[PDB]
User: Which sequence fits this backbone?
């Protein structure tokens, strides 16, 4: 994997295993499993009651309150139709599949359910882009800090949109490696034509975040991506959303991959060192 | 006059009276005997009943007996009975180890430089058919690495690793008689300290005596050479240089001196008559060695797989015979005694052997 | 060698008849050998695998391997020459090298867990062999010292259940669910300066 | 290295050559053995005083001495945290395959970087000047290795960044 | 360069 | 801390050495080559990457690529590799022991400067460094305070008018034309003659050919006419394979591209026209001094007769009432390095350096305000 | 598991031996003969099939057939029989005890490699093996890393340019002309003289005659003219029956077919032309090294004077400004085997082998991916 | 290259007659692949791509991956060992070297001609590669007339038919008086 | 061979 995927393959696999035997009579196959994914959010699949004819999926979003305050009426009918019901687990969006009714599609529904986290996350970014597109008075900027102690802020003014990232590294070992990783992020531009500007700042927080109570400290960097309609229209919106949401885990995974790469290089060099040493043993 | 007897190192060497037989420890739980064949060497016998490592051998010019003094806190006195060799158990009462051994000129007793802080002297007894052992432990405070004997056989020097090189006075009245007057002292009874080193000068790895019995010399790990002249009022002479530590001691005549060690080649010294000072002599063995190599098309590719292809066996020590002659273990003598020594031999840790001369150089 | 009609590439997929119903264990070896060599008509099965390259059907019959493979467990000498030692006798030996008070309950609880143990009638063979050997040992022990008594026979039972394919996952789940796991688990600071030796603990070591 | 490292290398090489001399000494304290004396630290009779060859605060070396063995410990010139991490990982990967070396230890001395070991069992079955030459060569090449690792990680970060930014 | 000419 | 190292990242060559020496101690071209074939033999796992004279020697099985293009860096990995090679393998001096001096062409992007400073301060942790301009160092080497610089390097040609104690940043002109374009045009014309050269190895071969058998022509039309009588101008060169190539008009054709950029299709003017425009944009009084002093430097201005042609063209363009003098030192190739060494040796410059403490507290933007 | 066995399935001969020895321990021709008559005597039920020196001795009542034709196997049963014979009767070493090394000519069909690997892994269940090229082993034997190989075997002649640490797979030329065609042409000409030879036994006789009384001619026309004065060139050979055959121009006629393939009617070029084309297709810089080193191997290049003729032809074709050297070791017959043994002895190659776990998993499509 | 690979399959062709035979084979049974790796994978499942050709002697040759392997050499010159770039890269470099304004027009019009560009799917692959390399904000169009083989001859005939060109010819009188060098200055 | 030459 290079671009971290957005479709959790666990739900895809379990739903495929369930549906491939769906047309086999009165087959309940009681299921009750708990999962976890990036952003420190817990999933849960479990039948509502003894009736096993219905399967339910739920989320435990950390910043759920902001989503509820904003209102996601768009998400209740566009991607998810009539198979969405009020929250049960922890006041967080939960859906269920009605097996008694014939499920016509097999892959489309599974794919739609696979991107649940990003599907709910987009409710704010797409709405801000709509606000700036529609000509409505620039909606008040918002700050969305997810499970990680870091913070996310967005400003949606006329003629452009903005987004800023706050980064926090826990272990002392990876702090410097991540700093080096993000140092060259703001400059690599020789292979991109229609791409947004990128900048890095750690000592001086941007003037936008002074009033906002976002991630403020000392060992915290900042990354901002300037947005323009040429790469934020109705066509190139999903790709940008996927890239930004999968930014954090992308950085993490590629840091670990670099660690493995350097491990391999040093392991290779050990052989040369041993070859040099072997000059001491006799013929 | 270099020769090789085994790739692996060799602990100690011993020779017969006619210089026709050799003793080589293979660094294993046994000892081998090599004999001359025209101008060639070949194995003859194979003696092995010791389960430990052998570290000391010696030969009797007349008795034709061989002693194996090593690990296992034991020691066997080999004797020849017809055309085969048989052991002879001995008791030494040791608890740690034993490294060096040496017989006596008159072949009546032998001493072991045990590693148990003790020095043992034994003599033959026909009553119990055994070899009784006495002990000297009064002044000793550490291991002893080198032992040498005096003509009369009453004076013993036991080098140690405690800055000292001391002469002793052992006299077993059972198999010994009163020695003639000696300048050193009074030939006091067994188990006493006669005299000690004047001061601290490195450890001790060897000792050498003189026919007149008036001069004693030893070497040290501190790149120093000493010469205890007892003829005068215990005059002591010293010398030093930049050479690496020496690990052997021997001299030719009343004034000469020879030694060798990690320098990889012999070094010669000398002693003045009245000046009470020594001097230096460089590479009395020969001027220098030579080096050579070959193409070895097979080797050119074989070495690249493990080592670098351009690599080779050439070394800076090839020119001055410092390539293969890894260190020197000890020294011996060929003809007569320590008076003229027309030829001298040395042992090597490389697993081989070599001979030299003192007159073929012809200054 | 016993058959032809398969490609070199798709060998293991052909060799996986073992995972199918295609292997039964056998109380006796030669008996079934002559049974096959006598009739050789009904006991022989057939394979109808599908090629993964040219999509051409290829078939081969099923022979003595229906039982020999699974029988190798009790006769390992066929494959590994170094280890010429059965399993059931190893079980009794290991159970006989532990204190007296524990020998009795141990024989009563032998768990059938693992993929290679899915073979049918495995438990019957192991139970019968262990019962035979233990009864023989008891009779030998009683022979030397006479007595009109009769010890209660040792009971050996093999249990068949689900979970045989995977018996480690549920154990790990219960491991995680236990709060004491969060306390016994080695911590970061332990590895920080002591080193990774914290994970070196083993059940067969101690000084 | 004439004006920067040559004198340091010459001094340490001379010290090693002088202290590379070794001999076999039957155990004096424990029954019958020939185990290394430096590690045991039983008798002060055989031990020789430690020596150090250094020119900066953060880089150092130590030279031990004994009849049976001579021990040498080095401290590398590491400045940034990345340098420390890379040196630690590289040395660990060297430890993991130290059996074939027959010279190296299995864990560095406390508070110091990697250290080596020599013995009379490794002086005859192996050549003498080659071992010191290899130790020297490692001392020089450590800086090259760390710089190469640093540029490699920088290039990896650059390439991943370039690969991600293209999608936008 | 980025715009105009290559470099 | 006794001296400093001056490194000139030339567009086609690298010059380095100690501060104080009159000649560089390391002169190798900027080549970072990688193997192009697969490799079969087992006794060699050698150096996946190649740099320096090694790359030049075994260029026949490598895809040579120049890290720097027309004065602006394109691949940072290659530049870091060459820096490491020069610092360790050739100089064998640790970065911490002494500081480093860097030079770059004028009117370069600030991104390159910031990235170079960040890499130098972070990777090699140099105690201090500085960034300068090749033309000012050329002035320092020439021992003069007033004149106009013709820094026609392998990648960029630029001029910077100067006066006593001050410069004129508003009269700086930079031309992308340089030796690489001349080599490309030479290859194109060598094709018209009948000799074909495409890959980079033949690029180096043609570069050597131009370095050895090229010169400028005082009059283009007269030289062409004399070429029509081609019996005294053709010369022969020996290729590595032994083939002999005869070169005629191409000797004096490619250099004329400098005075006639229209040959390559560039809508610009020649070096003479650009220098005339730059001097005219200056104040009237300093025009006399600028005319009286015209320093030139770089590896593209060693063609015999170039000075005479430039003098003739400038005098023809300039009014014919004063005297125009051209100064052509015979060591202009390393003038920049000599100037850098002299500047480093200056006592007053020992405090103008940029150290790690101030750089870390301030940031990469400090170098921007440091002498522009 | 202490050593390995190297087997060279030569088009006309088989070489085998232990890894480490400097000479092969088994050298017999590849002959698989079967009886041609009926058989009457009763005290013999002997060996319906014959192989090896036995076949050579009793060739008069057998239909000898070569299992390998021009480098490609035609009958697999014969090859398996010869493999079994060499492994058991001659070497007397079980396949399981040690691994086996195999060599084959370049540009061979993948089907042959896959079948050979499958048979070796299935029938003899060898622990491991590998497949290599004769030319690279020739380089290893010669102790060189750069040059051009002239592997003119009994069945195939091919060249493979090489450079330090890498090869040039795109400049490999394989020619079907080899010793067998030379023997056929020799038979045809011996017919024109007056001596007839048709069956395989006389084929072996003519092969021996060529091996003993053939040489190359520096100049064809001069040799023909001197043959017109046939009083010092004719030589006599003693046949097994005692008949004496006088051979004149045929001694230097058949070898010339190598330089003049048009004699047999093949629309191709000679070895000199093919080597010149192969070297020209390489990069310019490596041409000098390739010219300076020209390794040749095989049993078809032992004719005296061949090296001199090749040198003269190459120098005439190549420019007369450098030096061309021909290296002709006197042990080129077993160079391939020596190279294979040295390669096997290499420590680094102990891991490149292909084991059986490998084959337990997939049709031998694995020979190619890897092991090449 | 096709001959070399046909050798790796098991079929040998050396002389010029077989050169013509292989030329015909390529002319009849070769095509370009949109994705090289996907085509190779589908070839791993070789049950729908192999095709047979009838030789003059009657022998039948089965060709699989070679159909879409040789054309890829145009986009991957490294196969033959040439240190150059593909047609897409060369066209991109040529267009980039032009002025900025005319780049749009050049992108909007891309004429191709010659006998080596008749492989089906070549236009689609070229379009995809150019769009991937070029910025994804404009439209790139490939024009592939079905008579590109004789386009040069048609253009020459049309140019000759032009009235204005009746005077641009080079006659014997001017050639003899001037010399062979005249053609050099005639429209370069 | 199959086509060209025999083998
Ligand atoms: N002897 C020479 N004569 C003419 N040109 C030369 C000569 N030597 C080098 N050159 C040219 O000058 C260039 C290198 O000189 P240099 O000044 O180092 O370029 P840079 O400005 O990057 O330092 C080369 O590209 C070469 O074309
Ligand atoms: N002494 C010789 N003189 C000339 N040619 C020989 C001689 N011995 C063999 N040959 C020729 O070389 C061929 C065998 O050499 P060889 O290299 O073993 O073929 P291959 O390469 O298949 O192993 C024979 O067919 C023979 O024609
Ligand atoms: Mg320059
Ligand atoms: Mg052959």
Assistant:
């Amino acid at each position: 994997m290079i671009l971290l995927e957005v479709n959790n393959r666990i739900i895809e696999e379990t739903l495929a295993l369930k549906f491939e035997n769906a047309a086999a009579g009165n087959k309940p196959e009681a299921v009750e499993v708990t999962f976890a994914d990036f952003d420190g959010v817990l999933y849960h699949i479990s039948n509502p009651n003894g009736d096993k004819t219905k399967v339910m999926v739920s989320i435990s979003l950390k910043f759920y309150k902001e989503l509820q305050a904003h209102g996601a009426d768009e998400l209740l009918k566009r991607v998810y139709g009539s198979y969405l019901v009020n929250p049960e687990s922890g006041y967080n969006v939960s859906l269920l599949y009605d097996l008694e009714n014939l499920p016509a599609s097999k892959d489309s529904i599974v794919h739609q359910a696979g991107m649940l986290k990003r599907n709910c996350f987009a409710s704010v970014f797409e709405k801000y882009f709509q606000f700036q597109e529609e000509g409505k008075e620039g909606e008040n900027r918002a700050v969305i800090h997810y499970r990680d102690d870091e913070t996310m802020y967005v400003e949606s003014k006329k003629d452009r949109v903005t987004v800023v990232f706050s980064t926090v590294f826990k272990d002392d070992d990876d702090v410097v490696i991540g700093k080096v990783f993000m140092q060259e992020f703001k400059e690599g531009r020789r292979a991109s034509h229609t791409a947004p500007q990128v900048l890095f700042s750690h000592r001086e927080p941007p003037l936008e975040l002074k009033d906002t109570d976002a991630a403020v400290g000392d060992n915290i960097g900042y990354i901002t991506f300037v947005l323009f309609p040429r790469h934020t229209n109705a066509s190139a919106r999903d790709n940008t959303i996927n890239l930004i949401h999968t930014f954090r885990d992308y950085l993490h995974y590629h840091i670990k991959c670099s660690k493995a790469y350097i491990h391999t290089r040093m392991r290779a060099k050990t052989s040369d060192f041993l070859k040099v040493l072997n000059r001491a043993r006799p013929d | 006059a270099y020769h090789s007897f085994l790739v692996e190192p060799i602990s100690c060497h011993a020779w017969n009276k006619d210089r026709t037989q050799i003793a080589i420890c293979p660094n294993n739980h046994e000892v081998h005997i090599y004999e001359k064949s025209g101008n060639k060497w070949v194995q003859v016998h194979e003696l092995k009943e010791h389960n430990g490592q052998v570290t000391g051998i010696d030969w009797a010019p007349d008795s034709n007996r061989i002693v194996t003094c090593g690990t296992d806190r034991n020691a066997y006195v080999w004797t020849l009975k017809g055309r085969t060799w048989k052991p002879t158990l001995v008791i030494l009462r040791i608890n740690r180890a034993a490294r060096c051994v040496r017989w006596a000129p008159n072949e009546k007793k032998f001493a072991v430089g045990s590693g148990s802080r003790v020095i043992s002297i034994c003599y033959f007894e026909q009553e119990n058919d055994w070899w009784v052992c006495k002990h000297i432990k009064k002044p000793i405070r550490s291991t002893v690495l080198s032992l040498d004997w005096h003509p009369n056989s009453v004076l013993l020097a036991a080098g140690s690793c405690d800055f000292k090189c001391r002469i002793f006075s052992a006299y077993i009245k059972e198999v010994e008689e009163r020695p003639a007057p000696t300048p050193w002292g009074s030939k006091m009874p067994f188990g006493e300290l006669m005299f000690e080193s004047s001061s601290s000068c490195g450890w001790v790895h060897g000792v050498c005596f003189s026919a007149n019995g008036s001069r004693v010399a030893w070497v040290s790990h501190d790149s120093t050479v000493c010469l205890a002249d007892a003829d005068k009022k215990m005059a002591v002479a010293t010398l030093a240089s930049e050479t690496l530590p020496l690990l052997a001691v021997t001299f030719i005549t009343e004034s000469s001196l020879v030694a060798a060690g990690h320098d990889c080649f012999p070094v010669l010294f000398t002693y003045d008559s009245a000046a009470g000072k020594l001097s230096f002599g460089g590479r009395l063995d020969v001027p220098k060695q030579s080096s050579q190599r070959g193409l070895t098309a097979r080797e050119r590719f074989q070495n690249l797989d493990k080592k670098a292809s351009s690599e080779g066996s050439a070394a800076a020590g090839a020119g001055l015979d410092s390539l293969h002659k890894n260190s020197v273990s000890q020294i011996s003598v060929l003809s007569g005694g320590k008076a003229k020594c027309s030829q001298f031999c040395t042992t090597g840790m490389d697993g081989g052997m070599s001979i030299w001369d003192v007159r073929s150089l012809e200054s | 060698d016993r058959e032809v009609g398969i490609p070199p590439e798709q060998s293991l997929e052909t060799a996986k008849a073992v995972k199918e119903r295609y292997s039964y264990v056998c109380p006796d070896l030669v008996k079934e050998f002559n049974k096959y060599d006598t009739d050789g008509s009904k006991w022989i099965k057939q394979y109808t695998g599908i090629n993964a390259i040219s999509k051409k059907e290829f078939s081969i019959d099923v022979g003595y391997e229906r039982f020999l493979g699974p029988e190798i467990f009790f006769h390992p000498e066929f494959a590994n020459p170094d280890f010429t030692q059965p399993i059931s006798e190893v079980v009794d030996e290991v159970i006989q090298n532990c204190p007296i008070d524990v020998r009795r309950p141990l024989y009563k609880n032998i768990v059938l867990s693992g993929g290679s143990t899915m073979f049918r009638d495995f438990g019957r063979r192991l139970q019968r062999d262990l019962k035979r050997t233990v009864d023989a040992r008891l009779k030998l022990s009683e022979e030397l010292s006479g007595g009109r008594l009769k010890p209660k026979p040792i009971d050996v039972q093999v249990i068949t259940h689900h979970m045989q394919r995977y018996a480690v996952w549920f154990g790990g789940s219960m491991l995680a669910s236990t709060p004491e796991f969060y306390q016994v688990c080695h911590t970061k600071k332990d590895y920080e300066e002591i080193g990774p030796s914290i994970c070196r603990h083993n059940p067969v070591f101690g000084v | 290295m004439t004006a920067t490292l040559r004198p340091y290398l010459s001094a340490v090489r001379a010290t090693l050559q002088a202290a590379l001399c070794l001999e076999n000494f039957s155990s004096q304290v424990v029954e019958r053995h020939n185990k290394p004396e430096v590690e045991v630290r039983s008798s002060k009779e055989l031990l020789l005083q430690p020596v150090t060859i250094s020119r900066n605060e953060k880089e150092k070396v130590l030279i031990e001495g004994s009849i049976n063995s001579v021990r040498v410990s080095i401290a590398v010139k590491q400045a940034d945290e990345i340098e420390k991490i890379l040196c630690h990982k590289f040395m660990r990967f060297m430890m993991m395959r130290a059996e074939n070396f027959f010279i190296l230890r299995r864990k560095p001395v406390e508070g110091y970087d990697i250290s080596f070991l020599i013995t009379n069992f490794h002086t005859e079955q192996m050549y003498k000047h080659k071992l010191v030459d290899f130790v020297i060569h490692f001392m020089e090449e450590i800086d090259k290795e760390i710089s190469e690792m640093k540029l490699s990680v920088n290039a990896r970060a650059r390439i991943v960044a370039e690969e991600f930014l293209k999608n936008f | 360069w980025x715009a105009x000419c290559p470099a | 801390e006794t001296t400093a190292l001056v490194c000139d990242n030339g567009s086609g060559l690298v010059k380095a050495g100690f501060a104080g020496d009159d000649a560089p101690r390391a002169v190798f071209p900027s080549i970072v080559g990688r193997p192009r074939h697969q490799g079969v033999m087992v006794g060699m796992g050698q150096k996946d990457s190649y740099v320096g004279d090694e790359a030049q020697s075994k260029r026949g099985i490598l895809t040579l690529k120049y890290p720097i293009e027309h004065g602006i860096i394109t691949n940072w990995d290659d530049m870091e590799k060459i820096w490491h090679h020069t610092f360790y393998n050739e100089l064998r001096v640790a970065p911490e022991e002494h500081p480093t001096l860097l030079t770059e062409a004028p009117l370069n992007p600030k991104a390159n400067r910031e990235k170079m400073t960040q890499i130098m301060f972070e990777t090699f942790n140099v105690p201090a460094m500085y960034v300068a301009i090749q033309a000012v160092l050329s002035l320092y080497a020439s021992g003069r305070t007033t004149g106009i610089v013709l820094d026609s390097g392998d990648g960029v040609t630029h001029n910077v008018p100067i006066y006593e104690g001050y410069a004129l940043p508003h009269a700086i002109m930079r031309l992308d034309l340089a030796g690489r374009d001349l080599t490309d045009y030479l290859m194109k014309i060598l094709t018209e003659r009948g000799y074909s050269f495409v890959t980079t190895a033949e690029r180096e071969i043609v570069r050597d050919i131009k370095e050895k058998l090229c010169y400028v022509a005082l009059d283009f039309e007269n030289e062409m006419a004399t070429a029509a009588s081609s019996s005294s101008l053709e010369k022969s060169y020996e290729l590595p394979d032994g083939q002999v190539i005869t070169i005629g008009n191409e000797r004096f054709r490619c250099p004329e591209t400098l005075f006639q950029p229209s040959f390559i299709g560039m809508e610009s003017a020649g070096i003479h026209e650009t220098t005339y425009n730059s001097i005219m944009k200056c104040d009237i009084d300093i025009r006399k001094d600028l005319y009286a002093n015209n320093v030139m430097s770089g590896g593209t201005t060693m063609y015999p007769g170039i000075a005479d042609r430039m003098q003739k063209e400038i005098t023809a363009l300039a009014p014919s009432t004063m005297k125009i003098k051209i100064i052509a030192p015979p060591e202009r190739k390393y003038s920049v390095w000599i100037g850098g060494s002299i500047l480093a040796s200056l006592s007053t410059f020992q405090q103008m350096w940029i150290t790690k403490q101030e750089y870390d507290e301030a940031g990469p933007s400090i170098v921007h305000r440091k002498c522009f």
Notes: Chain F has four domains: 2-28+70-135+335-368, 29-69, 136-182+272-334, 183-271.
